[PDB]
Structures are given as structure tokens and as C-alpha cells.
Design an enzyme around this catalytic site. Structure first.
Site, PDB file in Angstrom:
ATOM      1  N   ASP A 107      -0.084  -2.286   5.696  1.00  0.00           N
ATOM      2  CA  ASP A 107       0.816  -1.257   5.192  1.00  0.00           C
ATOM      3  C   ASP A 107       2.305  -1.572   5.446  1.00  0.00           C
ATOM      4  O   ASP A 107       2.637  -2.608   6.037  1.00  0.00           O
ATOM      5  CB  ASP A 107       0.444   0.099   5.806  1.00  0.00           C
ATOM      6  CG  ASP A 107       0.674   1.264   4.847  1.00  0.00           C
ATOM      7  OD1 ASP A 107       1.665   1.257   4.085  1.00  0.00           O
ATOM      8  OD2 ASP A 107      -0.144   2.212   4.878  1.00  0.00           O
ATOM      9  N   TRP A 141       3.075   0.045  -1.821  1.00  0.00           N
ATOM     10  CA  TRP A 141       3.294   1.238  -2.644  1.00  0.00           C
ATOM     11  C   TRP A 141       4.119   0.989  -3.906  1.00  0.00           C
ATOM     12  O   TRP A 141       4.710   1.925  -4.455  1.00  0.00           O
ATOM     13  CB  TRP A 141       3.982   2.367  -1.830  1.00  0.00           C
ATOM     14  CG  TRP A 141       3.711   2.395  -0.327  1.00  0.00           C
ATOM     15  CD1 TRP A 141       2.489   2.279   0.306  1.00  0.00           C
ATOM     16  CD2 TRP A 141       4.682   2.569   0.710  1.00  0.00           C
ATOM     17  NE1 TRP A 141       2.659   2.358   1.671  1.00  0.00           N
ATOM     18  CE2 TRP A 141       3.993   2.535   1.944  1.00  0.00           C
ATOM     19  CE3 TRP A 141       6.084   2.714   0.716  1.00  0.00           C
ATOM     20  CZ2 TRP A 141       4.653   2.663   3.180  1.00  0.00           C
ATOM     21  CZ3 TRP A 141       6.741   2.854   1.945  1.00  0.00           C
ATOM     22  CH2 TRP A 141       6.019   2.832   3.160  1.00  0.00           C
ATOM     23  N   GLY A 142       4.184  -0.259  -4.346  1.00  0.00           N
ATOM     24  CA  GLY A 142       5.002  -0.632  -5.495  1.00  0.00           C
ATOM     25  C   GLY A 142       6.487  -0.803  -5.183  1.00  0.00           C
ATOM     26  O   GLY A 142       7.292  -1.009  -6.096  1.00  0.00           O
ATOM     27  N   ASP A 162       0.699   7.060  -2.815  1.00  0.00           N
ATOM     28  CA  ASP A 162      -0.705   7.449  -2.609  1.00  0.00           C
ATOM     29  C   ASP A 162      -1.267   8.358  -3.691  1.00  0.00           C
ATOM     30  O   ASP A 162      -0.619   9.327  -4.126  1.00  0.00           O
ATOM     31  CB  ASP A 162      -0.878   8.132  -1.258  1.00  0.00           C
ATOM     32  CG  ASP A 162      -0.390   7.278  -0.095  1.00  0.00           C
ATOM     33  OD1 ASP A 162       0.031   6.094  -0.292  1.00  0.00           O
ATOM     34  OD2 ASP A 162      -0.423   7.810   1.028  1.00  0.00           O
TER      35      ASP A 162
HETATM   36  O1  LIG Z   1      -0.557   4.067   1.521  1.00  0.00           O
HETATM   37  C1  LIG Z   1      -1.238   4.293   2.736  1.00  0.00           C
HETATM   38  C2  LIG Z   1      -2.562   5.044   2.555  1.00  0.00           C
HETATM   39  O2  LIG Z   1      -3.417   4.353   1.668  1.00  0.00           O
HETATM   40  C3  LIG Z   1      -3.215   5.155   3.933  1.00  0.00           C
HETATM   41  O3  LIG Z   1      -3.462   3.838   4.367  1.00  0.00           O
HETATM   42  C4  LIG Z   1      -2.250   5.844   4.906  1.00  0.00           C
HETATM   43  O4  LIG Z   1      -0.999   5.153   4.957  1.00  0.00           O
HETATM   44  C5  LIG Z   1      -0.343   5.070   3.704  1.00  0.00           C
HETATM   45  O5  LIG Z   1       0.914   4.411   3.831  1.00  0.00           O
END
Ligand SMILES: O[C@@H]1[C@@H](O)[C@@H](O)CO[C@H]1O
Ligand SMILES: O[C@@H]1[C@@H](O)[C@@H](O)CO[C@H]1O
Ligand SMILES: O[C@@H]1[C@@H](O)[C@@H](O)CO[C@H]1O
Ligand SMILES: O[C@@H]1[C@@H](O)[C@@H](O)CO[C@H]1O
Ligand SMILES: O[C@@H]1[C@@H](O)[C@@H](O)CO[C@H]1O
Length: 614
Positions: free
Chosen positions: A142, A182-183, A203
Site C-alpha cells: 500500500d 490507488w491510481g 477504494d
Molecule cells: O486501498 C487499501 C484497501 O484496499 C485496504 O488495503 C486498506 O488500505 C487501503 O489503502
């Protein structure tokens, strides 16, 4: 005929992940119950393989030698105990960390107190080796610490990818990297070659909210980057909400259909212990799974939208004359939706239509197919036994360089690249089309005879296109076929000879159009619709910002909304006028260089207001 065999490329991950239903409220017993339900539901036989432990397993603690330590009250036996349990079921196990010094469990606590230290920065090799030694087969990395610290995503995930490869080489256990940023900073430009999957947006669901078809559709739209996905590398529109409370059976199928047409990972996120028989059957539909996991590795694309909100998506499948199709209705009423063979890149010859939810053939046509689609609903088809549009075939004019490549229209094309890789390991090359952003292509083992892998590329109208490979196996020719449903046009300024361009394949609402050296990329291919829209990426409208009506109004991309400020007249004098305003699309200050902003301006005879759109 089929004369060179198509080489199968790796599919997107299938499995289950803990985030959507549990947030950080996980421990050994939570994962074990989910594994047992996964097995009991027959998910493994359908192809579901990964059991992924997401945020919440680690509170950021390390021992004096910097080793990650866990709370064994929650993880008895340590983490190798849960990987052993998952492996005992013939399954693969996934883990989760951050690119920065602290993780999302610190920056955005969701079900637990903040967890300072919950990131891998400064410990990429140490942590990757640890995960591999514990028995993990997958790691999701992440970006909360990356975003917080100001890190560059491309160079950071490259370092992380290198550490992933070293860890797997040391242990002998392959490690699948999921990039989760997240792009941000446009991962579609750089992630192929670094990882098999990369998140394309924020998300799909936030803990405490109900599953939303609006959110689902936004994630799907944001994942469509067909030049970025190929040969085992996938755009990731996020974990499935299939089976979550509030979604109907029809919404669950639509979720599957759209993920399948993309070739997206199928990582279930519902609570498997209370999953219904119908939901299980929807996750397990083998015909839909076969489309998602297609051997050719290609991403589906929009091929028609004759009426706003009534859409046809097509995917080029393995073999020849085979397509999957999703007909999607985003309107508030039931309507007929048609897909045409011409749009799918097939000739007007007989093909057989099959409904993948009815599991039955439903007709033949030499031109197309129409089905009634419910409001908010979708239909999932294959079209097979068709005849492919005529290809071009090319031989390299210099080492790894194909020149004089022809397209009847600017737009997306399928390229089959011939090669031999008579070894036991895949090889990679860098591919660059014209002056576009380069991409990485993987070439799996072929045996002694040649095979092809396929890529989707965006080309400019004419015969001046080039495809250049660096590194990897010597190739033995390419085949090029268009997908006419994706047809667009370069919008080329008369004065500058440059093209209307959205910087670096950015999709964000409000990004301003600029002049740029023409290269034929998706960020330069504009589709003019019956509604007078100029559409980019299949889903962004050229837009006079905030309905501005005066000199200097910014011209941007924005989600299409049917308003007059997104409508354009392509006039016989070479001007392009905004309908709302009557003002001309204008290269500001009559500058001609890369990065010149496009605005609206009162129309005149000047050549910075003159364009070609063919
Ligand atoms: O995008 C992710 C989500 O998928 C989960 O992993 C929680 O953390 C967020 O940043
Ligand atoms: O290929 C694009 C080009 O068209 C311009 O937008 C600058 O960024 C590059 O990535
Ligand atoms: O409706 C407009 C939209 O079309 C875009 O211009 C952004 O601003 C909004 O007000
Ligand atoms: O003539 C140009 C006009 O077309 C607009 O670009 C603003 O600057 C002026 O100099
Ligand atoms: O973001 C800008 C882009 O708009 C282009 O003009 C090149 O410079 C970049 O910094």
C-alpha cells in the site's frame, strides 16, 4: 488460417481478501473460518487460489534487529502458522504492508488504534525475505506512507519489485506483488514489468458504507487502460463486493461481468461463512471465469455507445474470431442494446452468440446482436466462430523495429508478436509505440517452435507508426488488427502541427488539454459522437470548464454529463466551436510548443484556432 500458435500468458489472481468485510478486525481465527468456508463452497475447484490477509495483522512492532514482530495472542504460532493452514488446503497465502515508514493502519485507523511503524521503508529486502520465509505467496503493498512522505511512486515500487524478486529467488517461493497506490501518479504508465497487478483508483468500498453500484462503475471506468495491460500484467479495479449485504443477484452478476470483461483480479471480499448458494454460484460461473482468465491476457474496451448510458464492451479472446461482450445499461429504464461485428473488429460473416448466465447459445448473425437490458443491469455474451478483420503483417526493418505500420483510423489495435523462447523462463522486452510512453512485455517459454503473445496498442491514422522493442527474444514478425469500435481521431492544430493532448495519460476531472507532439496514444485519440462530444479514453468529455463563456475559459476533460459545454461543432472553416459559448477551441497566445494550453476564444481567422479531426 491460425498458423503460429498463441502462447498462454499468466491470468489475474483469483482468491479472497480480508479487507472489505472485516477491515482491520482480523486475527488467526477470522482467517481460518474464511478458509474453511472458501473450501466448503468449492471455490478452489473454480480457480480461486489466494487467501489474502490485508491490513490489521501487524501493529508496527519490530525487534532490535528490525524484524517484524506480531502479537501471538492474535496470531498463535506466528505468521508461519496461518500460511501453513492455508497451504494445507492447497491454497496460496497473501500478506500486506506499506511502501512508507508507517502504514494505512497508522494514517487511517479503521477498526483498531493507530499502528505507528506499520510500513516497510528502510526494510524492503528484510521484510520481503521475511514474508517469503513465513510462506507467503502474495504481498499487497500500500501507499499511505508513500502519500504522506511525498515519495515518487514509480521509482519506489521499482525498488520494492526488485526486493520482491530477490526474496522469491532466495526462498524458491514465487511472490506475487500487488501494487496498491490507488491510481495516484498514473500507475498504468509504469507498473507493467514491476508487478502483475496495480490498483487504478481509490477504494471500491469504505468500512461502514453499503456497497454501491455507482462506486463499482467509477472503479471500472478508472481501470480501463488497455495499452498498459498485457502478458500477465493487469489493471486492478479493486476487491469484489460480490455477495456483500445490499447487492442483489443481478448486481452481483453485473459486478462479475465487468471485472471479467476487464480481465480483472477476482479477489472476493464478502463474508464466506454466510454466503448464499446463489452468490457462491455467481462467483463460480465457469464461463464467466474463463472470460476473466482468458489465455490471451487482453483488456476489454468500450466498442459502442450509440445512446448515452447504453454501452457495449468487447474483449478479444484467445484464438481467432472470438469475443466476449458486455451490454451495460446505465440508464433508469430497460432498453435494447446492440453490438455490431464491425465494432468488434470482425467482418460481416456468421458468428454464434452465447449468453454466459443462461449458459446457452442464443443465435447467429453475420452483422450483430441485440438484447433487452434492464435499467442498471447487464448481459454477458461471447461471440465466437467469427471472421477476423484483415490484418497487416510486418517484418522488422531494423533490429527490433517495425516501421510503416498502418491504421485506417486512429485508435486501438491488437498486435500479435511472433517469437521463440526455447528456455524454461519468461523473458521481457520494452515496447515503445511511436513517441508514446513505453511498456514492458513478457514472453513466456514457447518450446522449439515460434509462438505469439498479444498486446493492445493505440496507433495514428496512416502508415507512419513504429513499434520498437528493446531487450528480450528476437521477434519474427508482427500482425496488426484494428478494433473499429475504439476509433477516434487526432485533433491536430493547423499552426503548430501538434495534437490535443491530456498530459501523461492522466484521467483526473479538470486536467487541461494542451498541444503535444503527435504520438497516437490514448491521451490523443478523440471520438466525436452523435451528441457532438469529443470523448477521450471512452469515458472523458472535452469540456469548457464550468460552462465558461469568455476568452481564456480552460478546456479540460470531465466526466461526460450531456451539457452544452461538452458539445462541439466541427466547422467547415477548420474551427471547432463550443456549443454553449460559440467560442473557438484555441491554442493560447498562438504558441505552438509542447504544453501550450487550450482555451476558448472568440473565433477569428488565425491558425491557432484551426484543426483537423479525421
Ligand atoms: O486501498 C487499501 C484497501 O484496499 C485496504 O488495503 C486498506 O488500505 C487501503 O489503502
Ligand atoms: O505520451 C505522453 C505525451 O502524449 C504527453 O502527454 C506527455 O506525457 C507522455 O507520457
Ligand atoms: O458542469 C460543469 C462541468 O461540465 C465541468 O465544466 C466542471 O464544472 C461543472 O460546473
Ligand atoms: O490571438 C491569440 C488568441 O487566439 C488567443 O490564443 C489569445 O491570445 C491571442 O494573442
Ligand atoms: O503538468 C505539466 C503539464 O501540464 C505539461 O505542460 C508539462 O509540464 C508539466 O509540469
Amino acid at each position: 488460417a491460425v498458423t503460429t500458435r498463441q502462447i498462454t500468458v499468466p491470468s489475474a489472481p483469483m482468491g479472497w481478501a480480508s479487507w472489505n468485510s472485516f477491515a482491520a478486525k482480523i486475527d488467526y481465527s477470522v482467517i481460518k473460518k474464511q478458509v474453511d468456508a472458501f473450501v466448503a463452497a468449492g471455490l478452489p475447484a473454480a480457480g480461486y487460489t489466494y487467501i489474502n490477509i490485508d491490513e490489521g495483522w501487524w501493529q508496527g512492532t519490530r525487534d532490535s534487529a528490525g524484524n517484524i514482530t506480531v502479537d501471538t495472542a492474535e496470531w498463535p504460532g506466528g505468521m508461519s502458522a496461518i500460511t501453513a493452514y492455508i497451504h494445507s488446503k492447497g491454497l496460496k497465502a497473501g500478506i500486506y504492508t506499506d511502501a512508507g515508514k508507517d502504514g494505512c493502519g497508522y494514517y487511517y485507523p479503521t477498526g483498531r488504534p493507530a499502528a505507528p511503524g506499520s510500513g516497510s521503508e528502510g526494510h524492503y529486502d528484510q521484510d520481503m525475505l521475511q514474508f517469503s520465509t513465513w510462506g507467503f505467496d502474495f504481498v499487497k503493498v500500500d501507499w499511505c506512507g508513500g502519500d504522506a512522505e511525498g515519495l515518487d511512486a514509480a521509482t519506489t515500487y521499482k525498488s520494492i519489485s526488485d526486493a520482491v524478486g530477490r526474496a522469491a529467488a532466495t526462498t524458491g517461493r514465487p511472490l506475487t506483488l500487488s501494487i496498491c497506490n490507488w491510481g495516484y501518479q498514473n500507475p498504468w504508465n509504469w507498473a507493467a514489468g514491476q508487478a502483475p497487478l496495480w490498483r487504478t483508483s481509490t477504494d471500491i468500498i469504505y468500512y461502514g458504507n453499503q456497497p454501491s453500484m455507482t462506486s463499482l462503475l467509477s472503479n471500472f471506468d478508472q481501470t480501463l487502460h488497455p495499452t498498459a495491460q498485457h502478458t500477465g500484467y493487469y489493471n486492478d479495479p479493486d476487491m469484489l463486493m460480490v455477495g456483500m449485504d445490499g447487492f442483489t443477484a443481478a448486481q452481483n452478476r453485473t459486478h462479475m461481468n465487468l471485472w471479467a470483461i476487464s480481465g480483472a483480479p477476482l479477489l472476493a471480499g464478502n463474508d464466506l461463512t454466510t454466503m448464499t448458494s446463489e452468490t457462491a454460484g455467481i462467483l463460480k460461473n465457469p464461463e464467466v471465469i474463463a472470460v476473466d482468465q482468458d489465455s490471451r491476457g487482453l483488456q476489454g474496451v468500450k466498442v459502442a455507445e450509440d445512446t448515452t448510458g447504453l454501452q457495449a464492451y468487447g474483449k478479444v479472446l484467445s484464438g481467432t474470431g472470438n469475443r466476449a461482450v458486455v451490454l451495460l445499461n446505465r440508464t433508469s429504464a430497460a432498453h435494447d442494446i446492440t453490438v455490431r461485428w464491425s465494432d468488434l473488429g470482425l467482418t460481416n460473416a456468421s458468428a454464434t452468440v452465447r449468453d454466459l448466465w443462461a449458459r446457452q447459445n442464443v443465435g447467429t448473425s453475420a452483422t450483430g446482436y441485440t438484447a433487452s437490458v434492464p435499467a442498471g443491469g447487464s448481459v454477458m455474451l461471447t461471440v465466437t466462430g467469427g471472421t477476423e478483420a484483415a490484418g497487416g503483417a510486418y517484418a522488422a526493418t531494423s533490429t527490433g523495429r517495425y516501421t510503416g505500420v498502418t491504421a485506417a483510423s486512429t485508435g486501438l489495435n491488437v498486435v500479435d508478436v511472433a517469437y521463440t523462447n526455447n528456455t524454461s523462463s519468461a523473458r521481457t522486452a520494452t515496447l515503445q509505440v511511436n513517441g508514446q510512453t513505453a511498456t514492458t512485455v513478457s514472453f513466456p517459454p514457447t518450446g522449439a517452435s515460434a509462438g505469439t503473445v498479444s498486446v493492445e496498442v493505440s496507433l495514428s491514422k496512416g502508415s507512419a507508426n513504429t513499434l520498437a522493442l528493446s531487450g528480450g527474444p528476437a521477434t519474427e514478425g508482427i500482425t496488426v488488427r484494428p478494433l473499429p469500435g475504439t476509433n477516434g481521431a487526432l485533433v491536430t492544430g493547423k499552426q503548430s502541427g501538434r495534437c490535443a493532448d491530456i498530459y501523461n495519460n492522466t484521467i483526473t476531472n479538470g486536467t487541461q488539454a494542451e498541444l503535444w507532439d503527435c504520438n497516437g496514444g490514448p491521451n490523443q485519440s478523440w471520438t466525436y459522437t452523435s451528441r457532438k462530444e469529443l470523448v477521450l479514453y471512452g469515458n472523458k468529455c472535452l469540456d469548457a470548464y464550468n460552462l465558461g463563456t469568455t476568452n481564456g475559459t480552460k478546456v479540460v476533460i470531465w466526466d461526460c454529463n450531456g451539457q452544452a459545454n461538452q458539445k462541439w461543432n466541427i466547422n467547415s472553416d477548420g474551427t471547432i466551436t463550443n456549443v454553449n459559448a460559440g467560442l473557438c477551441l484555441d491554442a493560447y497566445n498562438a504558441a505552438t510548443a509542447n504544453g501550450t494550453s487550450l482555451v476558448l476564444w472568440s473565433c477569428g481567422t488565425g491558425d491557432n484556432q484551426k484543426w483537423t479531426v479525421t
